Symmetry: D2
Subunit: 249 residues, 4 copies
């Protein structure tokens, strides 16, 4: 069974309290992995424990991935308590509807526009550096999965998207340059960008979304479990997953 | 079991006589699908029948996918003999090492340079049109899988690549515009681009490739079976699969 | 004056009878270049001669760029009559509104769908090979300009676009691989992709286009003259030019 | 003369003390524009004044574009002293050679890896928001030019590039989403991404670069003056400029 090498290993999943990240934590735990689920608000993560049917576990830890200090505190706690990080899932992300500028009367705040870059692009850079330092310390070839977006690969028509696409284009380039760097030094850690179209979560992408095709969080988690299950010599660089009949925004 | 809806259905796989396409035909047949494997030379396809362990089958038919007449003859035979096409796998493709021009003393022939476009880009356009006409005639939402390349998404450094990358950039755009068109008319047929890095097959990509990481044909077929297995409401638009430590050419 | 090195040289411009190509021929001739304008119908090209104010000229020749034989006959006539090709402008192209398939009741003919690939992608491959063979025979570092499209860089939402975007994605990859090949062999011929948004020409992109921002043919020709004017050591790989306030289709 | 509408207007150019930005400031001033050149170290900007031959001017101001407070102080000084910002050139940027991780023994510091995102991506977001607020306050349709990179459009092979490509992919997406937003609200401000290959400046891209083709700073400034010169109804969305025979890293 391809998930056997992962039973009993440790996965860190950012954005674990809601949405895609909450579904990844349950599917990993059901596969026998010990998950450390992190978010700024941990109450909902604690509650996922009642859905674990398999032999893995879910542990909640508080962390704002935009803050280098908070990320270092979480990785130090993991190292002290669980040991090696075997899987890193950079799933936390935000989206604020409105404009870069006020030409449409919907400019987002400067705090929000900076936050979208810090969480969606800086967050995965900082977490990937801590995860890989743990993996290489432990002589272990693990797997980094970055939850990207179709908007990391095309420019949305909607003018509500501000710098969200910019952050995900950032993450496309980051993901590829990280895998490039590992490969150039003959290191066997895997990196995958998983890019969803619309998913029903707590992220409001379109307020008027009730009639639009939308994936479930489990559909995305299912795709993440497939890419972790692939053999140690096989990378899935990119897996773009969208609901059928989607019309991108 | 997610492959249950596919048992007993018909898949057409171009480039079935060798490489990735031969591995797709065996993995589909082992999953209970009746495969029609096509290539310009059918002897090796006939031989794959001895590897079928499951309840599906493999039938060889001769076809040059660059020829509209040959493609129409094969689709007419399928319609007359097996009925609806449920899965279409556009896997046939070629690569000729050398240049567009003679500036390096390795210009490829005009026949070869035209052939690479006709097989790798026209072939999937013609086969997808026949497959979708069959699916919609039969009121069936099937799945089109196009075997692309990492070189459909970046420009190779090697000057041996001529218009191969152009043909695969063509196929990236084709694949996305086809799924766009189906979605815009609320049609639920799925389309996937699967983009491999180096795979050990009969295609000579690099003559000096013995030390390079390379996927096996089964690794690619495994990824094709995963995308066909996904639920009817879930598209995998793109699945890029590469051997670990690959340094793209 | 940066256009001085070009006065008295020979430019070949495909699609010269209408639209962007007719405007390129007049702007080149006004700059002192001797233009050979080609299209399937030459009457309108003959008429551009009355607009030449400068010291260059415009000569009409009949050629269907999708046909290897017609392209070879035109290049042989040029070689026999004018000598070296110094500038090649691959501007001819077509667009047929409607679908790859009939799911929307607007499927384009198989002849048309094959023609779009043959003219828009094969045509520039064949012309570039003849132009570069002429340049290198003559020990001259000339300039290849390919008229691409914004749709060579993103997938249109409109389902009227069929394989047009595929052909222009093809041309993006072709253009880059050609410049890659020249550079890898230390050859100094320049290659530029010029990618327009909507331009008012004889190509019907949107039937309901009267209120949409649209470039004029001269705006595009102006950009082509800028890229030819750049110094021999400076490449403009890509110049994307769009009317202000455009909303891509 | 197409630069007439710009004589006497105000341009802000970040990264003015060296390299491409210093060359842009002199070429703009020679065209009659009043330039405000900004960088963290202003001494070299003061010195460019002796190269102004035309009727424009160069004024030095200190600003770290990664700091929202420093950017707001500079824009407030400009508003108080010169008035409307007519042209914004986001040219400041950094590159630190080495890795995201330490797998190759060349990991860059966490301060540096965060700085590359803050300067190269946050900087242009903050400056563009202040510039556009000034333009729209003044009812003026100006021009935003972002100095990107070929590495904002492909993933470098070199493992010395860390998150530099990520930052420039960020800037590609930012630039396009900004122009998207302006167009969607029928605003006529122009946005251009100018993407150079190697340029000889104070940025060390390759330590062993003496034999590589390299643009001069003036070549890039020349391309920036061309895109500002284009008519008010014509956008140059992207202008990629590279030295001839370049082999991208
Ligand atoms: N249609 C879609 O929903 C869609 C489409 C494609 C891609 N995505 C991507 O999917 C990923 C998951 O989002 P989702 O759709 O599941 O949205 P969601 O339901 O809002 O979940 C976002 C999760 O991230 C956490 N988070 C946000 N900022 C954080 C930070 N600074 N530090 C730590 N945790 C943080 C949130 O919890 P806290 O607020 O408590 O910290 C929450 O757990 C994101 O990267 C998103 O861009 C979503
Ligand atoms: N490293 C790699 O091998 C690699 C990497 C990424 C992508 N790919 C893609 O993988 C696909 C499969 O190629 P492969 O690597 O498995 O190579 P392969 O072993 O050479 O197989 C190519 C198959 O296509 C058939 N074929 C070629 N031209 C055809 C035509 N005109 N009509 C019908 N069949 C045709 C060949 O048989 P006949 O000659 O008998 O017709 C053979 O069955 C291609 O699209 C290729 O571009 C391969
Ligand atoms: N909005 C736009 O118009 C737009 C946008 C972006 C890109 N483009 C690109 O701009 C280029 C020029 O088109 P246009 O807009 O100027 O359209 P146009 O007015 O229709 O001109 C097309 C020209 O190409 C010629 N042509 C077509 N097929 C040919 C072939 N097989 N052999 C030789 N000549 C051929 C046509 O003449 P014959 O029919 O007599 O041969 C005509 O001279 C095309 O590559 C197009 O894709 C146009
Ligand atoms: N091969 C190349 O050189 C090349 C290739 C393509 C793209 N680019 C892009 O070209 C642009 C210009 O760089 P260059 O090559 O001319 O390099 P350069 O000679 O090092 O100039 C960089 C300029 O940016 C300023 N700067 C850096 N960080 C800043 C910050 N936080 N705040 C304000 N100013 C800042 C620097 O001055 P201070 O340190 O005093 O602040 C200097 O004036 C960059 O965006 C770069 O990515 C360069
Ligand atoms: Na991977
Ligand atoms: Na799909
Ligand atoms: Na060029
Ligand atoms: Na512009």
């Amino acid at each position: 069974d391809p998930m056997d090498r992962w039973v009993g290993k440790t996965a860190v999943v950012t954005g674990a309290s809601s949405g895609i990240g909450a579904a990844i934590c349950v599917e990993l735990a059901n596969a026998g992995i010990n998950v450390v689920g992190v978010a700024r608000r941990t109450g909902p993560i604690e509650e996922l424990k009642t859905q674990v049917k398999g032999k893995g576990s879910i542990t909640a830890r508080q962390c704002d991935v935009s803050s280098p200090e908070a990320v270092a505190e979480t990785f130090k706690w993991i190292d002290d308590n669980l040991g090696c990080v075997h899987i890193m899932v950079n799933n936390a992300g935000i989206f604020t509807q409105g404009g870069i500028t006020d030409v449409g009367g919907d400019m987002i705040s400067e705090k929000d526009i900076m936050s979208v870059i810090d969480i969606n692009l800086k967050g995965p850079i900082l977490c990937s550096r801590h995860a890989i330092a743990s993996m290489t310390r432990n002589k272990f070839d693990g797997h980094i999965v970055n939850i990207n977006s179709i908007a990391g690969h095309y420019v949305p028509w909607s003018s509500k998207f501000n710098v969200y696409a910019s952050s995900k284009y950032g993450l496309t380039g980051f993901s590829a340059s990280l895998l490039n760097e590992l490969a150039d030094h003959k290191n066997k850690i895997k990196v995958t960008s998983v890019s969803p179209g619309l998913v029903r979560t707590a992220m409001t992408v379109a307020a008027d979304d009730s009639e639009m095709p939308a994936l479930t969080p489990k559909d995305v988690a299912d795709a993440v479990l497939y890419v972790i299950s692939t053999p140690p010599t096989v990378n899935i660089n990119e897996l773009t997953i969208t609901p059928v009949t989607e019309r991108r925004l």
